[PDB]
Design a protein around this ligand. Structure first.
Ligand SMILES: O=c1[nH]c(=S)[nH]c2[nH]c(=S)[nH]c12
Ligand SMILES: [Zn+2]
Length: 271
DNA sequence: CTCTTTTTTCTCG
DNA sequence: GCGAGAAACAAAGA
């Protein structure tokens, strides 16, 4: 998932599990708890969920007075809220059991991670990850964004994917944002003129906020949180190889950029 | 059978 | 420091 999908999961968890006492925690894949599963089980059993936050693509469970469980879903992580008798599924790894259901974390590729840290370690934790600003008008300052672009010879798509200019874009939304802003993904950022940077800045905010509003992009679903999204019906380029661009009618092309599949309109996004 | 495809962090030169 | 490539892992498609 990308930021909009994580925000959608965050919102459903906030509505459904805040106030719930963790009755027990179990793992079939304890090694994905980077701070130690047995330690986490000892610390969090019996505590109540107070809130769910997010920073970039990271989910943050606020548990008890002092605990923060930082969860990253990476490529394929999925949470679901299940009955206590729900059958095990093959790629389920962890579960937090409440009195009237359980929150199960599943992840085919096993990339996702859990880290238990304290409240006052959250801000230093994200500083150490070098996460950039949230993609909002209030936090995403165009002036710094522009100065960083002007200094760099990096290509715009890999630089945006670093999470350092702005947090939350992944392969789907960076391709959508670049199409919307009419920027070729291989453009060196120091070649972007001010008006292109302005359009890019606004487009990042607008695309991600639209995606949040539509509940993220779910291709297929299953019973998982976040699976009722509608943003996939709005994608203009991602996964549209060979289809016609909706602005100019040229076929969308797919290339590889810094090892990522990359979809763009060659007319609208001039090299 | 092989090769390729689908977020973060590392090695290597 | 950089970029290229690959690793972590599993599955599906050519
Ligand atoms: O954290 C990241 N750092 C880099 S350098 N590239 C990249 N691409 C995605 S998606 N996430 C990240
Ligand atoms: Zn076009």
């Amino acid at each position: 998932p990308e930021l909009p999908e994580v925000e959608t999961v965050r919102r459903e968890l906030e509505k459904r599990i805040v106030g719930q006492k963790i009755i027990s925690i179990e793992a079939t894949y304890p090694r994905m708890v980077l701070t130690g599963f047995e330690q986490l089980k000892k610390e969090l059993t019996g505590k109540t969920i107070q809130g769910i936050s997010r920073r970039g693509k990271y989910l943050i469970f606020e548990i008890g007075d002092d605990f923060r469980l930082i969860s990253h879903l990476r490529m394929e992580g999925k949470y679901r809220l299940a009955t206590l008798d729900a059958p095990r599924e093959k790629h389920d790894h962890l579960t937090m059991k409440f009195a009237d259901g359980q929150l199960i974390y599943a992840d085919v590729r096993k990339f996702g991670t859990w880290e238990l840290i304290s409240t006052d370690q959250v801000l230093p934790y994200f500083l150490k990850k070098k996460i950039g600003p949230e993609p909002t008008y209030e936090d995403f300052d165009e002036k710094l964004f522009r100065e960083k672009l002007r200094k760099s010879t990096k290509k715009i798509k890999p630089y945006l994917l670093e999470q350092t200019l702005v947090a939350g874009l992944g392969n789907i939304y960076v391709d959508e944002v670049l199409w919307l802003a009419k920027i070729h993904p291989e453009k060196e950022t120091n070649q972007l003129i001010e008006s292109s940077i302005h359009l890019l800045h606004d487009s990042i905010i607008e695309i991600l906020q639209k995606a949040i509003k539509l509940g993220g992009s779910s291709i297929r679903t299953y019973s998982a949180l976040g699976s009722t999204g509608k943003m996939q019906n709005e994608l203009q380029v991602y996964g549209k190889t060979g289809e016609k661009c909706s602005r100019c009618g040229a076929e969308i092309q797919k290339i590889k950029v810094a090892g990522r599949g990359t979809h763009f309109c060659p007319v609208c996004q001039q090299k």
